[PDB]
Coordinates of C-alpha atoms and ligand atoms in Angstrom, one line a residue:
Chain K
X1 CA 130.4 -127.6 119.8
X2 CA 133.4 -129.7 120.8
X3 CA 137.1 -129.0 120.9
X4 CA 138.8 -132.0 118.8
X5 CA 141.7 -134.0 120.3
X6 CA 144.5 -134.1 117.5
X7 CA 146.5 -137.1 117.0
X8 CA 149.0 -137.0 114.2
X9 CA 150.6 -139.8 114.8
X10 CA 151.0 -142.1 111.1
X11 CA 150.5 -138.6 109.0
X12 CA 150.9 -139.2 105.6
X13 CA 152.0 -137.1 102.8
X14 CA 148.7 -137.0 100.0
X15 CA 150.5 -135.5 97.4
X16 CA 153.2 -137.8 97.5
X17 CA 153.5 -141.4 95.5
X18 CA 152.2 -141.3 91.8
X19 CA 148.9 -139.4 90.9
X20 CA 146.0 -141.0 90.3
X21 CA 143.3 -139.0 88.6
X22 CA 139.1 -140.6 89.4
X23 CA 136.5 -139.5 86.9
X24 CA 133.0 -140.9 88.0
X25 CA 130.1 -140.8 86.1
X26 CA 126.5 -141.9 87.1
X27 CA 123.1 -141.9 86.2
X28 CA 119.7 -142.9 88.6
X29 CA 116.3 -144.6 86.7
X30 CA 115.0 -140.8 87.3
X31 CA 117.4 -138.5 85.1
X32 CA 120.0 -137.4 87.8
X33 CA 123.1 -137.2 86.4
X34 CA 126.9 -136.6 88.3
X35 CA 130.4 -136.2 87.2
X36 CA 132.9 -135.6 89.5
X37 CA 136.6 -136.0 89.8
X38 CA 138.8 -137.3 93.1
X39 CA 142.2 -137.9 93.3
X40 CA 143.4 -141.3 94.8
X41 CA 143.3 -140.7 98.5
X42 CA 140.1 -138.1 98.3
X43 CA 136.8 -137.5 97.6
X44 CA 135.3 -135.2 94.9
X45 CA 137.1 -132.0 94.5
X46 CA 135.5 -131.2 91.0
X47 CA 131.4 -131.6 90.5
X48 CA 128.4 -131.3 88.6
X49 CA 125.2 -132.3 89.5
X50 CA 122.2 -133.0 87.6
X51 CA 123.9 -131.1 84.5
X52 CA 124.1 -127.8 86.7
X53 CA 127.9 -125.7 86.4
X54 CA 131.0 -127.3 87.5
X55 CA 131.7 -126.8 91.6
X56 CA 134.1 -127.1 93.8
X57 CA 135.4 -125.5 96.9
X58 CA 136.7 -122.0 98.8
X59 CA 140.5 -123.5 98.5
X60 CA 141.1 -124.9 95.0
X61 CA 141.0 -122.7 91.7
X62 CA 137.4 -122.0 90.5
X63 CA 136.1 -125.0 88.0
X64 CA 136.4 -124.2 84.6
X65 CA 134.4 -126.0 82.0
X66 CA 137.1 -125.3 79.4
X67 CA 139.7 -127.7 81.3
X68 CA 140.1 -130.6 79.0
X69 CA 139.3 -132.7 82.1
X70 CA 135.1 -131.0 82.6
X71 CA 135.4 -131.8 78.3
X72 CA 136.1 -135.6 79.1
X73 CA 133.3 -135.7 82.0
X74 CA 130.7 -134.0 79.7
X75 CA 131.9 -135.7 76.6
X76 CA 131.0 -139.0 79.5
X77 CA 127.6 -137.7 80.5
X78 CA 126.6 -138.0 76.6
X79 CA 128.0 -141.7 76.9
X80 CA 126.6 -142.6 80.0
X81 CA 123.0 -141.9 78.7
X82 CA 123.0 -143.3 75.3
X83 CA 124.2 -146.0 77.3
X84 CA 121.8 -146.0 79.9
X85 CA 119.0 -145.9 77.4
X86 CA 119.6 -149.4 75.8
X87 CA 121.0 -151.5 78.4
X88 CA 119.6 -150.2 81.9
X89 CA 115.6 -151.8 82.6
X90 CA 115.2 -151.9 85.4
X91 CA 115.4 -149.0 88.1
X92 CA 119.1 -147.9 89.6
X93 CA 122.1 -146.0 89.6
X94 CA 124.4 -147.4 86.7
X95 CA 128.6 -145.9 87.1
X96 CA 131.2 -145.6 84.7
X97 CA 134.1 -144.8 86.7
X98 CA 138.0 -144.1 85.3
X99 CA 141.2 -144.8 87.6
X100 CA 143.5 -143.0 85.6
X101 CA 147.4 -142.1 86.8
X102 CA 149.1 -139.3 85.0
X103 CA 150.5 -137.9 82.9
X104 CA 149.3 -141.5 81.0
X105 CA 146.6 -142.4 81.9
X106 CA 146.6 -145.9 80.8
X107 CA 143.6 -146.1 82.6
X108 CA 141.3 -148.1 84.2
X109 CA 137.5 -148.5 83.5
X110 CA 134.9 -149.8 86.1
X111 CA 131.2 -150.3 84.9
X112 CA 128.8 -150.2 88.6
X113 CA 125.4 -151.0 88.7
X114 CA 123.2 -150.6 92.1
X115 CA 127.4 -150.5 93.3
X116 CA 128.1 -154.3 91.8
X117 CA 130.9 -154.3 89.2
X118 CA 129.6 -155.6 86.2
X119 CA 132.4 -155.0 83.7
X120 CA 135.9 -153.3 83.6
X121 CA 138.7 -153.2 81.5
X122 CA 142.6 -152.8 81.9
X123 CA 143.5 -152.0 78.5
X124 CA 144.6 -155.6 78.2
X125 CA 141.7 -157.6 79.5
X126 CA 138.1 -156.5 79.5
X127 CA 136.0 -158.8 81.6
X128 CA 132.4 -159.2 82.0
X129 CA 130.8 -160.5 85.2
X130 CA 127.7 -162.4 84.6
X131 CA 124.6 -161.3 86.0
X132 CA 122.8 -159.1 83.6
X133 CA 119.4 -160.7 84.1
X134 CA 119.5 -158.6 87.5
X135 CA 119.5 -155.5 84.9
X136 CA 118.9 -156.2 81.3
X137 CA 116.7 -158.0 79.1
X138 CA 119.7 -157.5 76.6
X139 CA 122.6 -159.3 76.6
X140 CA 126.4 -159.6 76.7
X141 CA 126.9 -158.2 72.9
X142 CA 124.9 -155.0 74.4
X143 CA 127.3 -155.0 76.8
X144 CA 130.2 -154.8 75.4
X145 CA 130.1 -151.7 72.8
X146 CA 130.7 -150.0 76.1
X147 CA 132.7 -152.2 78.0
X148 CA 135.4 -149.4 77.0
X149 CA 133.5 -146.6 77.6
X150 CA 135.6 -143.5 75.6
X151 CA 138.5 -143.0 74.2
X152 CA 140.9 -140.8 76.1
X153 CA 142.8 -138.2 73.8
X154 CA 141.5 -135.1 75.4
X155 CA 143.1 -136.4 78.6
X156 CA 146.5 -137.7 76.8
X157 CA 146.7 -134.8 74.4
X158 CA 146.6 -132.2 77.9
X159 CA 148.4 -135.1 79.7
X160 CA 150.9 -133.0 81.0
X161 CA 149.1 -129.5 81.4
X162 CA 147.0 -131.7 83.6
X163 CA 149.3 -133.1 85.9
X164 CA 150.6 -129.6 86.6
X165 CA 147.0 -128.4 87.6
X166 CA 146.1 -131.1 89.8
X167 CA 149.6 -131.2 91.7
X168 CA 148.7 -127.0 92.3
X169 CA 144.7 -128.6 93.7
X170 CA 146.4 -131.4 95.3
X171 CA 149.3 -128.8 97.1
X172 CA 145.9 -126.5 97.8
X173 CA 143.7 -129.3 99.7
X174 CA 147.4 -130.1 101.8
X175 CA 146.9 -126.6 103.2
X176 CA 143.1 -126.7 103.8
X177 CA 143.3 -129.8 105.5
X178 CA 143.6 -128.0 109.1
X179 CA 141.7 -130.5 111.9
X180 CA 140.9 -127.7 114.2
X181 CA 139.3 -125.7 112.0
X182 CA 136.6 -128.6 111.2
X183 CA 133.4 -128.2 113.0
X184 CA 132.7 -131.2 115.8
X185 CA 129.9 -132.2 117.2
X186 CA 128.3 -134.8 120.2
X187 CA 124.9 -134.6 120.8
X188 CA 122.7 -136.3 123.0
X189 CA 119.1 -136.6 124.0
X190 CA 117.8 -137.4 120.2
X191 CA 114.8 -140.0 122.0
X192 CA 113.6 -137.7 123.9
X193 CA 110.4 -140.1 125.0
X194 CA 112.2 -142.5 126.2
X195 CA 113.4 -143.2 129.3
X196 CA 116.3 -145.8 129.6
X197 CA 117.7 -145.3 126.2
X198 CA 119.0 -142.9 124.1
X199 CA 121.3 -142.0 120.8
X200 CA 124.2 -140.3 120.8
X201 CA 125.3 -138.4 117.9
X202 CA 128.7 -137.4 116.4
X203 CA 128.6 -135.1 113.7
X204 CA 131.2 -133.5 111.7
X205 CA 131.8 -130.5 108.9
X206 CA 134.3 -129.9 106.9
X207 CA 135.3 -127.9 103.3
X208 CA 138.0 -130.3 102.7
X209 CA 137.1 -133.3 100.8
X210 CA 139.4 -136.2 102.5
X211 CA 138.0 -139.6 102.9
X212 CA 136.9 -140.1 107.0
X213 CA 136.0 -143.1 109.1
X214 CA 133.5 -141.9 111.9
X215 CA 133.3 -144.5 115.0
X216 CA 131.5 -143.6 118.1
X217 CA 132.3 -146.2 120.6
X218 CA 130.4 -146.9 123.9
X219 CA 132.0 -146.6 127.1
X220 CA 133.0 -150.4 127.1
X221 CA 134.2 -150.2 123.4
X222 CA 131.5 -153.2 123.2
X223 CA 129.6 -151.5 120.7
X224 CA 130.0 -149.0 118.0
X225 CA 128.6 -147.2 115.2
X226 CA 131.5 -146.8 111.8
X227 CA 130.3 -143.9 109.0
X228 CA 132.4 -143.1 106.3
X229 CA 132.1 -139.4 104.4
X230 CA 130.0 -138.9 101.3
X231 CA 130.8 -132.7 103.0
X232 CA 129.1 -134.0 106.2
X233 CA 130.2 -137.4 108.5
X234 CA 127.2 -138.3 110.5
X235 CA 127.1 -141.5 113.0
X236 CA 124.6 -142.4 115.1
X237 CA 125.1 -145.3 119.1
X238 CA 122.0 -145.9 121.0
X239 CA 123.2 -145.8 124.6
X240 CA 122.1 -146.3 127.7
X241 CA 121.7 -142.9 129.9
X242 CA 123.5 -144.3 132.1
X243 CA 126.1 -145.2 130.5
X244 CA 126.5 -142.1 127.6
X245 CA 130.0 -140.6 130.0
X246 CA 133.0 -141.7 128.2
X247 CA 131.0 -142.6 124.9
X248 CA 133.8 -141.7 122.5
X249 CA 134.2 -140.5 118.8
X250 CA 136.7 -141.3 116.2
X251 CA 137.7 -139.9 113.4
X252 CA 140.3 -140.9 111.0
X253 CA 141.4 -138.8 107.6
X254 CA 142.7 -140.0 104.6
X255 CA 145.4 -137.6 105.4
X256 CA 146.5 -140.2 108.5
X257 CA 145.6 -138.3 110.9
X258 CA 143.3 -139.0 114.1
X259 CA 140.5 -137.1 116.3
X260 CA 138.5 -138.3 119.1
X261 CA 136.3 -136.8 121.3
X262 CA 134.7 -137.8 124.6
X263 CA 131.8 -137.2 126.1
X264 CA 132.7 -135.8 129.4
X265 CA 130.8 -135.2 132.8
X266 CA 131.1 -131.7 132.3
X267 CA 128.7 -132.9 129.2
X268 CA 126.4 -135.6 131.1
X269 CA 126.1 -132.6 133.9
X270 CA 124.4 -130.4 131.5
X271 CA 122.0 -132.8 130.1
Chain L
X1 CA 135.8 -182.4 79.8
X2 CA 139.1 -181.5 80.8
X3 CA 139.8 -182.3 84.8
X4 CA 143.3 -181.4 86.8
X5 CA 142.8 -182.3 90.1
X6 CA 145.9 -181.3 91.2
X7 CA 145.8 -179.0 94.7
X8 CA 142.9 -180.7 95.5
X9 CA 142.0 -180.0 98.8
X10 CA 140.1 -182.2 101.8
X11 CA 136.6 -179.9 102.3
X12 CA 136.6 -181.7 105.6
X13 CA 139.6 -180.9 107.2
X14 CA 140.5 -177.9 109.4
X15 CA 137.9 -177.1 112.5
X16 CA 134.4 -177.1 111.0
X17 CA 132.0 -174.2 110.7
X18 CA 128.0 -174.3 109.7
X19 CA 126.6 -171.2 108.1
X20 CA 123.2 -170.0 108.7
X21 CA 121.3 -168.3 106.4
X22 CA 118.0 -166.5 107.0
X23 CA 116.4 -164.5 104.5
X24 CA 112.8 -162.2 104.4
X25 CA 111.6 -160.8 100.8
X26 CA 109.2 -157.1 101.4
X27 CA 106.5 -159.1 99.6
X28 CA 106.8 -162.2 102.3
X29 CA 109.0 -164.3 100.6
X30 CA 111.8 -166.4 102.6
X31 CA 114.9 -168.3 102.9
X32 CA 116.5 -170.4 105.1
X33 CA 119.9 -172.6 104.5
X34 CA 123.0 -174.2 105.6
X35 CA 126.4 -174.7 104.5
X36 CA 129.5 -175.2 105.5
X37 CA 132.4 -172.8 104.4
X38 CA 133.5 -174.2 101.4
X39 CA 130.7 -175.0 99.9
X40 CA 126.7 -173.4 99.2
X41 CA 123.9 -174.7 100.8
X42 CA 123.6 -178.6 101.9
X43 CA 119.9 -177.9 103.3
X44 CA 117.5 -175.1 102.3
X45 CA 114.1 -174.1 102.3
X46 CA 112.4 -172.0 100.3
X47 CA 109.1 -170.0 100.9
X48 CA 108.5 -172.0 103.5
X49 CA 108.7 -175.4 102.1
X50 CA 110.0 -178.5 103.5
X51 CA 113.9 -178.7 104.3
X52 CA 115.7 -179.5 100.3
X53 CA 118.8 -181.5 100.0
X54 CA 120.9 -183.1 97.7
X55 CA 120.8 -187.2 95.6
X56 CA 123.5 -187.9 98.3
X57 CA 123.1 -187.1 101.2
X58 CA 121.0 -188.2 104.5
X59 CA 117.3 -186.9 103.7
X60 CA 116.6 -183.9 104.9
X61 CA 114.8 -184.0 108.3
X62 CA 112.5 -181.4 110.6
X63 CA 113.4 -182.4 113.3
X64 CA 116.6 -181.8 113.5
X65 CA 117.8 -178.7 116.0
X66 CA 120.4 -177.4 112.8
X67 CA 117.1 -177.4 111.0
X68 CA 114.4 -176.1 113.7
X69 CA 117.3 -173.5 114.5
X70 CA 116.4 -172.6 111.3
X71 CA 112.7 -172.0 111.9
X72 CA 113.0 -170.5 114.8
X73 CA 114.8 -167.8 112.9
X74 CA 111.9 -167.1 110.0
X75 CA 110.4 -166.2 113.2
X76 CA 112.8 -164.0 114.7
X77 CA 113.2 -162.1 110.8
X78 CA 110.0 -161.9 110.5
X79 CA 109.3 -159.4 113.5
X80 CA 112.4 -157.9 112.8
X81 CA 111.6 -157.3 109.4
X82 CA 108.2 -156.3 110.1
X83 CA 108.9 -153.7 112.3
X84 CA 112.5 -152.3 111.5
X85 CA 112.6 -152.3 107.3
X86 CA 109.9 -149.7 105.7
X87 CA 111.5 -149.7 101.8
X88 CA 111.3 -152.5 99.4
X89 CA 114.7 -155.4 99.9
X90 CA 116.2 -158.4 101.1
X91 CA 117.2 -158.8 104.5
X92 CA 119.3 -161.4 105.5
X93 CA 120.7 -162.5 108.8
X94 CA 123.9 -164.3 109.0
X95 CA 125.4 -166.8 111.9
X96 CA 128.9 -168.2 111.3
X97 CA 129.3 -171.0 114.2
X98 CA 133.2 -173.1 114.6
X99 CA 131.6 -176.9 116.1
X100 CA 130.9 -178.1 118.5
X101 CA 132.0 -174.8 120.2
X102 CA 129.5 -172.7 118.7
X103 CA 130.3 -169.2 119.8
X104 CA 129.1 -167.7 116.8
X105 CA 129.6 -165.1 114.8
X106 CA 126.2 -162.5 113.2
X107 CA 126.2 -160.3 109.7
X108 CA 122.8 -158.0 109.0
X109 CA 122.1 -157.3 105.3
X110 CA 120.1 -155.4 103.2
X111 CA 120.1 -155.6 100.1
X112 CA 123.5 -157.0 100.0
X113 CA 125.0 -154.8 102.0
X114 CA 126.1 -155.3 105.7
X115 CA 124.1 -153.0 108.3
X116 CA 125.2 -154.5 111.1
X117 CA 127.0 -157.1 113.2
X118 CA 128.5 -158.7 116.2
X119 CA 131.8 -160.9 116.7
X120 CA 132.9 -162.0 119.8
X121 CA 133.0 -158.6 122.1
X122 CA 131.9 -155.5 120.2
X123 CA 128.5 -155.0 118.4
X124 CA 128.6 -152.6 115.0
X125 CA 126.2 -151.2 113.1
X126 CA 127.3 -149.1 110.1
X127 CA 125.1 -145.8 109.9
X128 CA 122.9 -145.8 106.8
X129 CA 119.6 -146.1 108.8
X130 CA 117.7 -143.4 106.9
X131 CA 118.2 -145.7 104.1
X132 CA 115.6 -148.8 105.2
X133 CA 114.3 -147.1 108.1
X134 CA 112.0 -144.3 109.5
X135 CA 113.6 -146.0 113.3
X136 CA 115.9 -145.4 115.0
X137 CA 119.2 -147.1 115.9
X138 CA 117.3 -148.2 119.4
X139 CA 115.0 -150.4 117.1
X140 CA 118.1 -151.7 115.3
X141 CA 119.7 -152.9 118.6
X142 CA 117.1 -155.1 119.3
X143 CA 117.9 -157.4 117.4
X144 CA 121.8 -157.0 116.3
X145 CA 123.0 -160.2 118.3
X146 CA 120.1 -162.2 117.5
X147 CA 119.1 -165.2 118.8
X148 CA 120.4 -167.5 121.5
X149 CA 122.2 -170.6 119.7
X150 CA 120.4 -172.9 122.7
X151 CA 118.9 -175.3 120.1
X152 CA 123.1 -175.7 119.2
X153 CA 124.4 -176.2 121.9
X154 CA 122.0 -178.6 123.7
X155 CA 122.8 -180.9 120.6
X156 CA 126.4 -179.8 120.2
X157 CA 127.9 -182.5 119.3
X158 CA 124.9 -184.8 117.6
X159 CA 125.0 -181.7 114.8
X160 CA 129.1 -181.8 114.7
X161 CA 128.4 -186.1 113.8
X162 CA 126.0 -185.5 111.6
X163 CA 127.9 -182.7 109.7
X164 CA 131.1 -184.1 109.7
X165 CA 128.8 -187.4 107.8
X166 CA 127.4 -184.6 105.8
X167 CA 130.5 -183.1 104.3
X168 CA 132.0 -186.3 103.5
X169 CA 129.1 -187.3 102.0
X170 CA 129.5 -184.5 100.0
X171 CA 133.5 -185.0 99.7
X172 CA 133.0 -188.4 98.0
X173 CA 129.8 -187.2 96.1
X174 CA 132.5 -184.5 94.1
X175 CA 133.2 -186.6 90.9
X176 CA 134.4 -183.4 88.4
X177 CA 133.3 -186.0 85.4
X178 CA 130.0 -187.2 87.0
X179 CA 128.9 -183.5 86.2
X180 CA 127.7 -182.1 82.8
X181 CA 129.7 -179.6 80.7
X182 CA 128.2 -177.5 77.8
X183 CA 130.4 -175.5 75.7
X184 CA 128.3 -173.7 73.3
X185 CA 128.2 -171.4 70.4
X186 CA 125.5 -170.1 67.9
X187 CA 123.2 -167.9 70.4
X188 CA 123.5 -164.7 67.7
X189 CA 121.6 -165.9 64.6
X190 CA 121.3 -162.0 63.1
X191 CA 124.4 -161.2 63.9
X192 CA 127.7 -161.1 61.3
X193 CA 130.9 -160.7 63.3
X194 CA 129.7 -161.6 66.2
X195 CA 128.7 -164.9 68.4
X196 CA 128.3 -165.4 72.0
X197 CA 130.0 -168.2 74.0
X198 CA 127.8 -170.2 76.3
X199 CA 129.8 -172.0 79.0
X200 CA 127.4 -174.1 81.1
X201 CA 128.0 -176.6 84.2
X202 CA 124.9 -178.1 86.0
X203 CA 126.0 -180.4 89.5
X204 CA 124.4 -182.0 92.1
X205 CA 127.3 -181.4 94.5
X206 CA 126.9 -177.6 96.0
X207 CA 130.6 -176.4 96.0
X208 CA 131.6 -173.3 95.8
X209 CA 132.6 -172.7 91.9
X210 CA 134.0 -170.0 89.7
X211 CA 134.0 -169.7 86.0
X212 CA 136.0 -168.1 83.6
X213 CA 135.1 -167.8 79.9
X214 CA 138.2 -166.6 77.8
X215 CA 138.5 -165.6 74.2
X216 CA 141.2 -166.8 72.4
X217 CA 143.4 -164.4 73.2
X218 CA 143.6 -163.9 77.2
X219 CA 141.9 -160.3 76.4
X220 CA 138.2 -160.3 77.1
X221 CA 136.7 -163.0 79.9
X222 CA 133.8 -163.1 81.2
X223 CA 133.1 -164.5 84.8
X224 CA 130.2 -166.6 86.9
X225 CA 130.0 -167.5 90.2
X226 CA 127.7 -170.4 91.0
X227 CA 124.9 -168.6 92.4
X228 CA 122.7 -171.2 95.0
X229 CA 118.8 -171.1 94.0
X230 CA 118.2 -173.1 96.8
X231 CA 119.2 -176.8 96.6
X232 CA 119.3 -175.5 93.1
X233 CA 122.8 -174.8 91.7
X234 CA 123.6 -172.8 88.5
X235 CA 127.0 -172.3 86.5
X236 CA 126.7 -170.5 83.5
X237 CA 128.5 -167.5 81.5
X238 CA 128.3 -165.8 78.5
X239 CA 131.3 -165.1 76.4
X240 CA 130.5 -162.4 73.1
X241 CA 133.1 -163.1 70.1
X242 CA 134.5 -162.3 66.9
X243 CA 133.0 -165.2 65.2
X244 CA 136.6 -165.6 62.7
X245 CA 138.5 -165.7 66.4
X246 CA 136.0 -169.1 68.0
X247 CA 138.1 -171.6 67.9
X248 CA 140.6 -171.7 71.6
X249 CA 137.8 -170.0 73.4
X250 CA 138.6 -171.9 77.0
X251 CA 136.2 -172.0 79.8
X252 CA 137.2 -172.9 82.7
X253 CA 136.3 -173.5 86.0
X254 CA 137.6 -174.0 89.5
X255 CA 135.9 -176.0 92.8
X256 CA 135.5 -175.3 95.9
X257 CA 137.8 -178.1 96.3
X258 CA 140.7 -177.8 94.4
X259 CA 140.1 -178.9 91.0
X260 CA 139.9 -177.2 87.3
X261 CA 138.0 -178.2 84.3
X262 CA 139.4 -176.7 81.2
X263 CA 136.5 -177.1 77.9
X264 CA 138.2 -175.6 74.7
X265 CA 135.7 -174.5 71.8
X266 CA 138.2 -177.4 69.5
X267 CA 139.1 -177.4 65.8
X268 CA 136.5 -180.4 65.8
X269 CA 134.0 -178.1 67.3
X270 CA 133.7 -175.9 64.7
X271 CA 133.6 -178.4 62.2
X272 CA 129.8 -177.4 62.4
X273 CA 127.6 -175.0 60.0
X274 CA 124.0 -177.3 61.1
Ligands
LIG1 C1 149.6 -147.4 83.6 O1 151.5 -148.1 83.4 C2 152.2 -147.8 84.5 C3 153.7 -147.4 84.0 O2 153.6 -146.2 83.7 C4 152.0 -149.4 85.0 O3 152.7 -149.4 86.4 C5 153.8 -150.5 85.7 O4 153.2 -152.1 86.3 C6 153.7 -152.7 85.9 C7 153.7 -154.2 86.4 O5 152.4 -154.8 87.0 C8 155.1 -152.5 87.5 O6 156.5 -153.5 87.4 C9 156.6 -154.4 88.2 O7 157.3 -154.0 89.7 C10 157.3 -154.0 90.4 C11 158.3 -153.8 91.5 O8 158.9 -153.2 91.3 C12 158.0 -155.8 90.2 O9 158.1 -156.4 91.5 C13 157.1 -156.7 89.7 O10 157.9 -157.8 89.3 C14 156.9 -156.0 88.5 O11 157.6 -155.8 87.1 C15 155.8 -151.3 87.4 O12 156.3 -151.1 88.7 C16 154.9 -150.7 87.2 N1 155.8 -148.6 86.7 C17 154.8 -147.8 88.2 C18 156.2 -146.7 87.3 O13 154.3 -147.3 88.2 C19 150.4 -150.1 84.8 O14 150.5 -150.9 85.1 C20 149.7 -148.9 84.1 N2 148.6 -149.6 84.1 C21 147.3 -150.4 83.1 C22 146.0 -150.3 84.3 O15 147.6 -150.8 82.1
LIG2 C1 144.1 -174.1 70.0 O1 144.7 -174.7 71.1 C2 145.3 -176.4 70.5 C3 144.8 -177.1 71.7 O2 146.1 -176.2 72.8 C4 146.6 -176.0 70.0 O3 146.8 -177.2 69.1 C5 148.4 -176.8 70.1 O4 149.3 -177.2 69.0 C6 150.4 -177.2 69.3 C7 151.2 -176.4 67.7 O5 151.3 -177.7 66.2 C8 151.5 -178.5 69.6 O6 152.1 -178.1 70.7 C9 150.3 -178.5 70.6 O7 150.6 -180.5 71.0 C10 148.7 -178.9 69.9 N1 147.6 -179.1 71.4 C11 146.8 -180.1 70.9 C12 146.1 -180.5 72.3 O8 146.6 -180.8 70.0 C13 146.1 -175.4 68.5 O9 147.5 -175.3 68.1 C14 145.7 -173.7 68.7 N2 145.3 -173.4 68.0 C15 145.9 -172.0 67.1 C16 144.6 -171.7 65.7 O10 146.2 -171.4 67.5
NAG3 C1 135.1 -168.3 119.7 O1 135.8 -169.7 120.2 C2 137.6 -169.7 120.7 C3 137.1 -169.2 122.0 O2 138.5 -169.5 122.4 C4 137.6 -168.6 119.6 O3 138.8 -169.2 119.2 C5 137.3 -168.1 118.5 O4 137.8 -166.9 117.4 C6 136.0 -167.5 119.1 N1 135.0 -167.3 117.8 C7 134.5 -166.2 117.3 C8 133.9 -166.1 116.0 O5 133.5 -165.7 118.4

């Protein structure tokens, strides 16, 4: 455990600018399912994992299955299962994602297969990217049944109600975003059998689902490891044990702050 | 076939770059390619075959040091793969090399995703190790920097000269009217409101191509990029279309040399209940 050095220069207002809600609905070959709601600069705030109850964080409203945004997700779970069942003929994850300006809700929808975009729709242009064989023996006509996704009437009927709720949620997220309350770790001695080489681990634990970018730099800054949040953030750098000192870790948030940790001579001595 | 050559560039201008791509699969399939910065591969080898190239170029000579550098990397990647990769997938090592000044960049890709890189001063690992390796980042870093480019630097100017001539022959070979273009419906035989319009282009010129098939309203499109099947160039795109709106579906092909080819599904072409 290590104490953060908080560089706040380049701080942004996460609740500033136009509001955007991101609805992500995924399915794998196993039958694993996910439904998530995020904001523009956040990871998942409300989620449902393999058909469980809507889950969230202790700094926000309890997640309610009767909320019109979650009813939207549940309808999509159904849609994606039917979708998955005709089209998908090789194993892999299918992701349908709505990017929704609020209070309209003229949404963009992206379809990803194994992380790649196979289709999209901005309500003006439908796009199919030509890679079908990769994941199906069915043709573009089948695919185009699903391209537009589901109607968003549930969202637009309650458009304003949804807005004031997620403005409230973002405001709670901003209040919870306290960099000094996250937990920070700088572990060495991960290669116990290697006499000359070691791995330096940097980890952060948080209950705030902002996007995080973690870089572990070597002493000379000629070697780095990069991780992104997925809520644990962890990254691992191979290092020479005689150059473990001054190896740093830098973490930047989606709210604009930057934490740096340093492997000090205090920590070298105790090792 | 409606060719537009406004904006055509000189693909052999600016500083030259050679791109060396070397791949291995779990089943032991392999690929080694050389391309310029604005092309797909010009020389390639597939599953250990002899170098293959195009009708317009020098016969691919296996004794060329650039090609020896590819075979040398075949050995590197086999060793790399054996002790790093513990789950099925394609590993690609890619050198981006300025010529004649061979201060190269190297990228590593697993399943199409970048896992490691070394540019000038800085080695980068992206921490996704525990998805392709049971082993540790200290194993990886044995391979990050790749091979010494000594085969390339020893022969720097000869390579520059050879590839300057290959680039000119390619630039000369790039002749849109000598490519083969097809625009075709009647793919969906048992469909009442729907058809598929297929746009295809066959070429011996390994430029990068971007293909869009547009509906009559420019409100629906299919996009295909030229894919490189090892000295084999596929550009094919398929657009689902309402049969009643098939007229004026247009296909639009753009090359990395700057030209665009439009193919329109014309009134004349609709006249056909064959
Ligand atoms: C969803 O609806 C919003 C509006 O409610 C659309 O946003 C608007 O998009 C237009 C066209 O891109 C923007 O107009 C542009 O404005 C810039 C800056 O002033 C100007 O220089 C450009 O020439 C252009 O006219 C407009 O700013 C923007 N409005 C707002 C309030 O954001 C959006 O495009 C819709 N999205 C979808 C997926 O349909
Ligand atoms: C389909 O596209 C063709 C080609 O653009 C259209 O033909 C044009 O029609 C206008 C009006 O008569 C003329 O000004 C152009 O000179 C024509 N172009 C050519 C090349 O013949 C045609 O109008 C379109 N068809 C439909 C049904 O809209
Ligand atoms: C190496 O070549 C020269 C050195 O001055 C420079 O222009 C270039 O940025 C370098 N290239 C890379 C990618 O290492």
